[PDB]
Design a binder for this molecule. Structure first.
Ligand SMILES: N[C@@H](CCC(=O)O)C(=O)O
Ligand SMILES: N[C@@H](CCC(=O)O)C(=O)O
Lengths: 258, 259
């Protein structure tokens, strides 16, 4: 039958076209992840439908109830066959879903307003005038929640107890908060997105050099999926043929403005 | 009567058109700095000739002889009326020529082959398997020669004594050397040029995060010349109306080829 692909509205992975109200089906969407889905579906020879995760979340596990939300929940509870998104491979998610080999590399990173005196997480941790936060339900929050490294536990400790909340619900809200804070808010986010925002107008944010960690995005499928193997191979082939590099160039750097 | 403009072939500031062999005079050339000259000559109303500096160099002073070469020398000894090129504003050059206000900002940067394990200039300084070098007679060489920062001084000492020479005569030679070295050569160059090349075919180069310094390009004229003020006056006006930003966009990002 047709494969249900869950994914998430996160520029430049998946974005709405300007005139999407005049378009239908998978043609409503464009982006790196839309192009990757097209290629994987070609190399695996299946038909697919792109769907946007209804809760708009990546995926995390509720501690009290052990239930998954976001794209992970869609796979675990059978609402979708495959997730194609900037979805971070992590040990905890690996317990309930299967990931392909990485199609992209990234690390947690810092975004500041051009001008802000910050060069590192250690600078952030040792001061208080500049507030910092993360997206409210992703691998970046969890990295800090679970870190045993002193700088990062201190940062998590400050972030969990800050009033008002330093967490945001969307990358766009975090970026907006950086722009509006006169250099008084730094946004902790993945380097691929930090890089994308850096080269878009109004060109007032900067990505601090040096990531806090190093990891990858994978295509995810449910445990037991017959699709699991074909998608892994599709990822490796497209990396061999250089297509992953071309799409990254296509969506990040071709369209720069700074 | 005609204003002689000295400049240098550096993509995307100044380039030969694909069909330059069918053209003559100022029509052989294209690029950011070509457009800027055409516009500056409009707002000041003079006719000009574009010339490519004969020694192909930006400009340096011989220690023993105190004589300048390159585009700086063309201005100091009266072979040209004005230089319009990615010519870096520096204190030692200001002793002998007049610079406009910056028309563009940049920093020293690092170019590697996609794959190379280098994350910073400090990383370069601490190892031996990967060679690095600069253009042989410009501000980037002098920045390193003169730096009181330990890493950059460690880098100059390695570069000057390295065998074979890690220095190159043209930006293109430095870029070619990166591609041909399987990640065994890193090229230290200015950020505007590194960024343009990164998104040009064959798309096998990368710019390390973080510039090593911050400085600007200026239009140069000879010391005392009346054309200096007339041309600076043109520089700032056209930025206010976005002319500089339009040319920056027109020549840099429009022209990607790696997606
Ligand atoms: N890529 C992350 C979302 C972004 C973030 O957590 O900063 C995830 O899969 O949870
Ligand atoms: N703009 C430099 C040339 C480029 C470089 O040294 O990297 C100069 O004015 O000498």
């Amino acid at each position: 039958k047709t494969v249900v692909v869950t994914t998430i509205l996160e520029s430049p992975y998946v974005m709405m076209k300007k005139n999407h109200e005049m378009l239908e089906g998978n043609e409503r969407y464009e982006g790196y992840c839309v192009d990757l889905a097209a290629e994987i579906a070609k190399h695996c020879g299946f038909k697919y439908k792109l769907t946007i995760v209804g809760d708009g979340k990546y995926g995390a596990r509720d501690a009290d109830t052990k239930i998954w939300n976001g794209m992970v929940g869609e796979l675990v509870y059978g609402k979708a066959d495959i997730a194609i998104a900037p979805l971070t491979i992590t040990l905890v998610r690996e317990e309930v879903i299967d990931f392909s080999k990485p199609f992209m590399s990234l690390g947690i990173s810092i975004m500041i307003k051009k001008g802000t005196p910050i060069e590192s997480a250690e600078d952030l941790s040792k001061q208080t005038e500049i507030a910092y936060g993360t997206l409210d339900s992703g691998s970046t929050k969890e990295f800090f929640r679970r870190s045993k490294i002193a700088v990062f536990d201190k940062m998590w400790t400050y972030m969990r107890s800050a009033e008002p909340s330093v967490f945001v619900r969307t990358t766009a809200e975090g970026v907006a908060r950086v722009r509006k804070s006169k250099g008084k808010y730094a946004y902790l986010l993945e380097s691929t997105m930090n890089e994308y925002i850096e080269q878009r107008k109004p060109c007032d944010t900067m990505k601090v050099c040096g990531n806090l960690d190093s990891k990858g995005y994978g295509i995810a499928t449910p445990k037991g999926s017959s699709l699991g193997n074909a998608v892994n191979l599709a990822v490796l082939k497209l990396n061999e043929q250089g297509l992953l590099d071309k799409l990254k160039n296509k969506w990040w750097y071709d369209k720069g403005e700074c």
